[PDB]
Design a protein around this nucleic acid. Structure first.
Lengths: 49, 73, 85, 154, 46, 157, 35, 153
RNA sequence: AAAUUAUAUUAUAUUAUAUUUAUUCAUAUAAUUAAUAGGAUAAUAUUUGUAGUUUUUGAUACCAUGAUAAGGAUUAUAAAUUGAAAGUGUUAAUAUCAU
């Protein structure tokens, strides 16, 4: 071959690059209650809106 | 629908009410504020079901009196 | 060079209160016409301090960066130190 | 006329050298024809000027061929004979425009610019509200208000 | 200052007017003190 | 399409009143509105703004906007009266969107009326039962409309 | 000039033999002059 | 060497501290200026003597802040970080994206550090808005992308 | 004494003669130093004025650079195309501050 560079990254290399980095838990964005109309914008000052 | 179109002038466009919430730094507080504003706009627009005094007035471009009417002046 | 963006920044009778002065009379005097906090004394005052009645009334010391105002009068009252020099 | 400022005179060769820009501008040449057509006057030096410059603009982008050499100066002098012939017709329309416009402005009670002569009213150059307080070439002080060349009742 | 206070009146609230409350921290990019120098609230710099 | 002047002439050598050349500040330009921005002679805050290009371009944009506004308001032979939904005619009994919200709405494509509802102007004499119920004396006379089928001078009779 | 070139190209596209005089008059020809 | 003398590093760090003090003080100074310089009533609740007393009190609060950053941004927005040459914002002696002078931009072009594409020096590059209307039209297009495409809530 | 290389376009200028201002210049000045430090949803270290003191800002030279002007040759045997335009060589004077 002598100079072969792939134009598609192989499935093993994609799997290794996926298996090394964690997930963000807020990416799931699940919601079943509703919006807190009174409290969510008036929470504690360090974590406030 | 008429009261919702008048109360949300440029936020309604092509049959779709769109609200761009940019108030808070986080998107969760932004979607909370957007849900609150959508519910407030809906509750204000629902007043047309109470009576005809909440039906918004049609704005007619009524002409000036014509030359046939101005001839009697 | 852009318009009126130079970092290093005249008698007129009908434009006396409107030339190099504040636009409105409703606004208050600037920060140099008042004492901010605990001071040991300033060697000179800024050029944007408005000459008030108490400048010509008391007359302790007027040092502008120099400039010594030892001739008090009432024709200077209501005007900053720019056009007085 | 609303142009009452002091003006700068130009030689007539510099006017005609503008060509299609100002001298033979087609919008300007049309409204010169409406002045002559209103007075019952044939537009013959203006039609002579337009027919010349219509064909002059047609070949004005062509490059002249190199002349390899002539024994006598006859084809070069003929090309120069017609060239100075075209300037003299355009000199006549340059005078015909300035003649009739100053004559119409005396009829319509139109006050001209500074140092401009109207043959019926102001034999000298009429000056009104100049920056110089005196007459520039008559050396006379100007009165206040400006000189009235016509009567009052419109 | 004692001769400067005649023509120039004194408005001295004190150091309480230089320290904004904790509820105004995020409006002022995290700060509370309005000094000429910046003030970090960590002990390692402090 | 309009052929009036919009831009300001640029800054160059001081022009003279010659052929094809007007001075940079003349009373003929912009209705004489350059009289505010001119210097008659052939204080820095009152001299620098007369020579800035963005300032004079903003000023002539303001003046052209004033001209556009007065010509759009001189076109108006009408006025807007807030009429309730019940007494309005049949073409306005629909949901009319706001300006620049939807496609420009035709008046009635079913009744072969293809025209913008926002440009519709109704006569005052046809709405006297709506605008004036308290008078009861018919303050405006009825509009005489010509008989289109009558044999007149237009139809060679 | 641009309007003339557009109308001439439309006439060439509609009737093809119209290209025989219209190219000879130089109406289908583009000059490259900028400011 | 080595990178730049340390007095210039001190100068760039003082410019960064001035930017940080601007971020610290701008909201407070803007609220104080907008309360203290208003003649219309603030609310139905606060009118008359209460409004004038509140404006005098917020003016006393605004004047008592020693070190409040009221300096505009364009007065010291021409500081270069690699070299000590001072340019002018608005002229060709300054480039806005990489925020260096013309000399430093030429050295980083000739050094190969940046990835920049050369275009003809009398054209408008490649941007269709820039070829269309110039600097003001791309200015308005950046405004239209940043703000005016959002329906405010 | 021909071929045309030629740009060409229009405007301005001064102690008339004195006055204010943007920059320039005079003479008074303020500003000074050094280095890291992880904090909710984590199976257990309480912690940070602590480890730094005689901290770094200190080599503008006589190298053999490079710009200026000037002369050479090749291609059009087509009426088509939006568009018949592009590459290749020699001498004088000036000049050369990096162990």
């Amino acid at each position: 071959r002598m100079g072969y560079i792939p134009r598609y990254t192989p499935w093993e290399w994609i799997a290794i690059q996926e298996a090394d980095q964690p997930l963000i838990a807020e990416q799931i964005r699940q919601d079943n209650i509703g919006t807190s109309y009174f409290f969510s914008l008036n929470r504690y000052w360090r974590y406030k809106a | 629908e008429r009261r919702l179109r008048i109360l949300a002038q440029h936020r309604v466009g092509m049959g779709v009410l769109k609200l761009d919430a940019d108030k808070y730094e986080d998107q969760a507080d932004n979607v909370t504020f957007g849900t609150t504003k959508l519910s407030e706009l809906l509750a204000d627009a629902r007043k047309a079901q109470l009576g005809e005094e909440y039906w918004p007035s049609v704005e007619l471009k009524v002409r000036k009196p014509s030359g046939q009417s101005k001839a009697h002046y | 060079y852009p318009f009126l963006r130079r970092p290093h920044i005249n008698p007129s009778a009908p434009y006396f209160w409107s030339f190099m002065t504040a636009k409105s009379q409703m606004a208050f005097l600037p920060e140099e016409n008042y004492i901010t906090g605990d001071w040991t004394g300033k060697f000179f005052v800024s050029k944007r301090q408005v000459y008030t009645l108490q400048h010509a009334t008391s007359g302790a010391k007027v040092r502008v960066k120099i400039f010594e105002f030892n001739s008090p009068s009432r024709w200077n009252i209501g005007k900053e130190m720019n056009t007085l020099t | 006329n609303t142009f009452l400022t002091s003006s700068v005179a130009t030689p007539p060769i510099s006017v005609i050298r503008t060509g299609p820009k100002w001298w033979a501008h087609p919008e300007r040449m049309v409204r010169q024809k409406l002045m002559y057509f209103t007075l019952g006057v044939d537009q013959l030096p203006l039609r002579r000027t337009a027919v010349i410059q219509r064909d002059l603009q047609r070949f004005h982008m062509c490059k002249p061929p190199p002349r390899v050499g002539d024994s006598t100066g006859y084809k070069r002098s003929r090309a120069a004979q017609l060239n100075t012939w075209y300037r003299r017709i355009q000199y006549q329309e340059y005078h015909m425009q300035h003649l009739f416009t100053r004559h119409v402005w005396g009829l319509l009670r139109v006050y001209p610019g500074n140092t401009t002569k109207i043959q019926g009213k102001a034999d000298d150059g009429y000056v009104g509200y100049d920056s110089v307080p005196f007459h520039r070439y008559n050396r006379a002080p100007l009165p206040f208000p400006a000189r009235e060349l016509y009567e009052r009742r419109k | 200052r004692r001769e400067l206070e005649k023509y120039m009146p004194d408005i001295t609230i004190g150091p309480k007017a230089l320290v904004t409350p904790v509820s105004l921290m995020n409006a002022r990019n995290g700060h509370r003190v309005t000094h000429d120098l910046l003030h970090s609230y960590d002990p390692h710099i402090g | 399409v309009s052929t009036g002047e919009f831009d300001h002439p640029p800054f160059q050598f001081r022009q003279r009143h010659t052929f094809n050349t007007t001075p940079l500040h003349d009373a003929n330009r912009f209705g004489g509105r350059t009289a505010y921005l001119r210097e008659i002679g052939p204080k820095k805050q009152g001299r620098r703004f007369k020579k800035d290009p963005r300032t004079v371009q903003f000023n002539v944009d303001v003046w052209c906007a004033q001209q556009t506004l007065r010509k759009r308001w001189k076109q108006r032979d009408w006025e807007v009266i807030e009429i309730p939904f019940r007494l309005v005619p049949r073409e306005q009994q629909r949901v009319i969107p706001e300006l620049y919200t939807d496609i420009p709405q035709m008046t009635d494509p079913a009744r072969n009326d293809f025209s913008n509802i926002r440009n519709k102007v109704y006569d005052r004499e046809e709405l006297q039962g709506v605008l004036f119920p308290a008078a009861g004396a018919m303050l405006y006379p009825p509009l005489q409309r010509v008989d289109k089928q009558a044999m007149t001078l237009d139809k060679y009779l | 000039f641009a309007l003339r070139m557009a109308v001439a190209n439309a006439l060439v596209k509609l009737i093809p033999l119209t290209r025989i005089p219209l190219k000879k008059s130089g109406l289908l020809s583009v000059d490259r002059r900028r400011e | 060497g080595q990178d730049v003398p340390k007095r210039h590093t001190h100068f760039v760090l003082e410019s960064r501290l001035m930017y940080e003090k601007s971020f610290r003080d701008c909201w407070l100074h803007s609220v104080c200026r907008a309360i203290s310089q208003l003649d219309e009533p603030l609310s139905k609740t606060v009118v008359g003597t209460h409004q004038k007393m509140l404006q005098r009190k917020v003016t006393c609060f605004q004047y008592n802040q020693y070190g409040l950053f009221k300096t505009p941004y364009y007065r010291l927005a021409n500081v270069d970080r690699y070299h000590a040459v001072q340019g002018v914002a608005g002229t060709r002696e300054w480039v806005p994206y990489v925020n260096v002078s013309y000399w430093t931009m030429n050295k980083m072009v000739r050094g190969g550090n940046l990835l920049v594409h050369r275009v003809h020096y009398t054209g408008w590059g490649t941007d269709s808005h820039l070829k269309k209307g110039g600097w003001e039209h791309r200015w308005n297009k950046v405004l239209q992308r940043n703000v005016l495409q959002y329906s405010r809530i």
